Amino acid sequence: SSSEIKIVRDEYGMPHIYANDTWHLFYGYGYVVAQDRLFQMEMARRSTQGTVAEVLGKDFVKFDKDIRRNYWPDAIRAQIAALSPEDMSILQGYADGMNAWIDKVNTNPETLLPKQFNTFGFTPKRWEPFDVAMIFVGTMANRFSDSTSEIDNLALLTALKDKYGVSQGMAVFNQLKWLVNPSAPTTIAVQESNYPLKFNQQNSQT
């Protein structure tokens, strides 16, 4: 059946989804996620969108602000709007699947509502593709691929040049924060290849 989604959980409760098309497949995925991790995913959503203070109060206002200042919603929405129907079906199916279970949860909370929701004083709302995308953007991109300390770096360099002088200060900077170190153990052996690109280590942009 084209509308059929089969969910088989193994001996550790791990779900396997069987479906014919993209939307149904990720609908099943989202469904089982809502069953297994609804509170975790709700709080992950609020974490990635900076809406934690909404349920946990003033101690998370700074957190929420920092989250929102670190991305641009409309840009993410534009990327989603540009997705082909096939790719959209991944996100839409996923969200729809979560909503299917979430609706059941809110129809019979006395039996299906995860305890934490009662404890923390709110109830789960439906998800959209944007929400699913932001779980990834906010927990993989914005936190594992968004690292820089250039402003601090420059402060260090400036301090070094003041202590040691211009030339020696620059040299000590290259000693503490080298651009490359040829003795660094590499995952790819030197016999295989090396990186072609070389950079300037003098801050010529000043």
């Binding site: 396997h16 997705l83 305890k115 990834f136 770096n153 003795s183 153990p185």
Partner: protein, 557 residues
């Protein structure tokens, strides 16, 4: 995070072995989510963080895949030129360009709502402001605008059936991530994926650049430039957040360095120790590396040289002999709270003192603090992530390596004094500190072991469970938040592939309204602790034979 992939030339009773240990910290419920997908071109099994549509850890019966953070430099800061007379504008290529801006309101439980404005330039979102010079910094990510493509690439790569199809997808993943590949034929591969900027000549990626236009990136580097290797001569691919490739530049983070001292060597050593490894031996590397003190190997030679001439009755001498007899593999005593050997405590105190005496001393305040950590610092709950060689230690390592170091020592970290003298002075500090606390009989020193905590707050510091759901493990283990292994063409199985993983505390985080915990709420917690693992199923026959429950849905879009 670590990963080792063993190819046909080094695999025993198999053609390829992939063992992945992504290190995200530890949380309850589990950081990752087990999931199998079968249909619409997918046939996969494994587990993935926050249940992303794409499985970061898994296989499809033909190839397997894994990841560790790349730590490339894909982020630069542009210093935007502002004008008090033109608020909301910045100078770019000779014109005053209007910033993008948006209003946001933070609603607050039991509090007053707060509205504020977020600002963005062509270089990215604005960090803050500095209107004395009339400047504001914008953070430029090479992956900007490629967030969804990266999510999708991580999904579509699951359908690849060979190196070419897989790299086609790796080329579309824009975040700085190491991707790993293995297949049923014993082929293995690695790609340091990600979008990286093609910077203007003279652009030092470690420091900010003007946002006025002349320093704008020329674009992004082609996929050809991304470090990659397919079936390396070595017969294996190992990574523990180390450098991808000779001459490849690291993240600009001042606390992050790829140098001579690198924990990945601990993995290389174990893989190269034996010509071939079995699946079980490959898995055992998790146990060994998770217990391996990472500084012993780096500094023992220095310690031995400095004390080689001291009499047997010199305590500094006996501290070094203690280390020399030690393999660096920590094991808990029967009390389940202290370590059998005091080596790590010795190295901690010594290294702390060394850094204070050397690197810390050569760096102006308050920057000196950046280089004072020994890497052992922790709390009662234990490390929040992996243990590594500290940035200060890596710099000290270059220094004690002398001329064997490729890094010019512009300033002598020992400031004219013989390295031996400083090393011995730190050993004196160490003996005083430790003997004061533990007494003078080293053989009965029972030093505190690090513990491990599955935290109820996610990595943001935000509750994802009730405080009481926090779980505790006596032995800290420097290992993946989860570990998964894929073995291709195992000779002792009727399957073309076997796979295992561990998702602790368990698959489910569900607790019913009446407090009744789900049957799979904690059934992998003890398994995690003892380096156990359970089978991942892929084929309909294997899934069926191990079915616990089934539910069929009929829905129309």
């Amino acid at each position: 995070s670590n990963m080792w992939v063993i190819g046909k030339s080094k695999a025993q009773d198999a053609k390829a072995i992939m063992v992945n240990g992504p290190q995200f910290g530890w949380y309850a419920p589990a950081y990752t989510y087990g999931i199998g997908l079968h249909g619409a071109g997918y046939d996969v099994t494994g587990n993935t963080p926050f249940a992303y549509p794409g499985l970061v850890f898994g296989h499809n019966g033909v190839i397997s895949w894994g990841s560790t953070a790349g730590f490339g430099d894909d982020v630069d800061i542009f210093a935007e030129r502002l004008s008090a007379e033109k608020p909301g504008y910045y100078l770019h290529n000779g014109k005053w360009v209007k910033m993008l801006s948006r209003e946001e309101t933070i609603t607050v439980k039991n509090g007053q709502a707060e509205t504020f404005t977020v600002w963005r330039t062509v270089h990215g979102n604005i960090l803050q402001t500095d209107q004395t010079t009339q400047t504001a910094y914008a953070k430029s990510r090479a992956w900007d605008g490629k967030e969804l493509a990266s999510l999708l690439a991580w999904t579509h790569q699951m359908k690849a059936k060979n190196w070419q199809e897989w790299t086609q997808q790796a080329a579309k993943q824009a975040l700085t991530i190491n991707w790993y590949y293995a297949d049923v034929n014993g082929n293995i591969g690695y790609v340091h994926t990600g979008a990286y900027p093609d910077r203007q000549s003279g652009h030092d990626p470690r420091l900010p650049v003007p946002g006025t236009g002349k320093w704008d990136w020329k674009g992004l580097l082609p996929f050809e430039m991304n470090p990659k290797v397919y079936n390396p001569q070595s017969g294996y691919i190992a990574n523990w957040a180390n450098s991808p490739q000779k001459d490849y530049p690291a993240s600009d983070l001042f606390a992050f360095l790829w140098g001579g001292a690198d924990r990945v060597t601990e993995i290389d050593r174990l893989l190269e120790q034996k010509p071939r490894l079995t699946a079980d031996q490959a898995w055992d590397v998790i146990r060994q590396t998770s217990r391996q003190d990472l500084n012993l190997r780096l500094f023992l030679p220095t310690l031995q040289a400095a004390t080689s001439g001291l009499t047997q009755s010199d305590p500094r001498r006996q501290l070094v002999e203690t280390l020399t007899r030690w393999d660096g593999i920590n094991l808990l005593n029967d009390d389940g709270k202290t370590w059998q050997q005091p080596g790590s405590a010795i190295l901690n105190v010594w290294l702390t003192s060394m850094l204070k005496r050397t690197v810390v001393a050569a760096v102006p305040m308050p920057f000196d603090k950046w280089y004072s950590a020994s890497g052992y610092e922790t709390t009662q709950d234990g490390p929040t992530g992996s243990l590594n060689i500290s940035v200060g230690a890596k710099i000290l390592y270059e220094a004690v390596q002398g001329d064997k170091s490729p890094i010019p020592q512009a300033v002598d970290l020992f400031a004219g004094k013989p390295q031996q003298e400083v090393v011995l002075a730190a050993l004196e500090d160490t003996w005083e500190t430790l003997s004061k606390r533990y007494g003078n009989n080293v053989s009965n020193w029972k030093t505190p072991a690090m513990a491990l905590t599955f935290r109820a707050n996610n990595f943001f510091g935000v509750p994802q469970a009730a405080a009481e759901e926090t779980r505790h493990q006596a032995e800290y283990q420097n290992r993946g938040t989860e570990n998964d292994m894929i073995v291709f063409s195992p000779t002792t199985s009727d399957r073309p592939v076997l796979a295992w993983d561990v998702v602790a505390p368990g698959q489910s985080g569900f607790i019913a309204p009446d407090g009744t915990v789900d049957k799979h709420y904690e059934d992998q917690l003890k398994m995690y602790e003892n380096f156990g693992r359970k089978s991942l199923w892929l084929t309909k026959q294997d899934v069926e034979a191990h079915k616990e429950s089934q539910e069929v849905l009929h829905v129309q879009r």
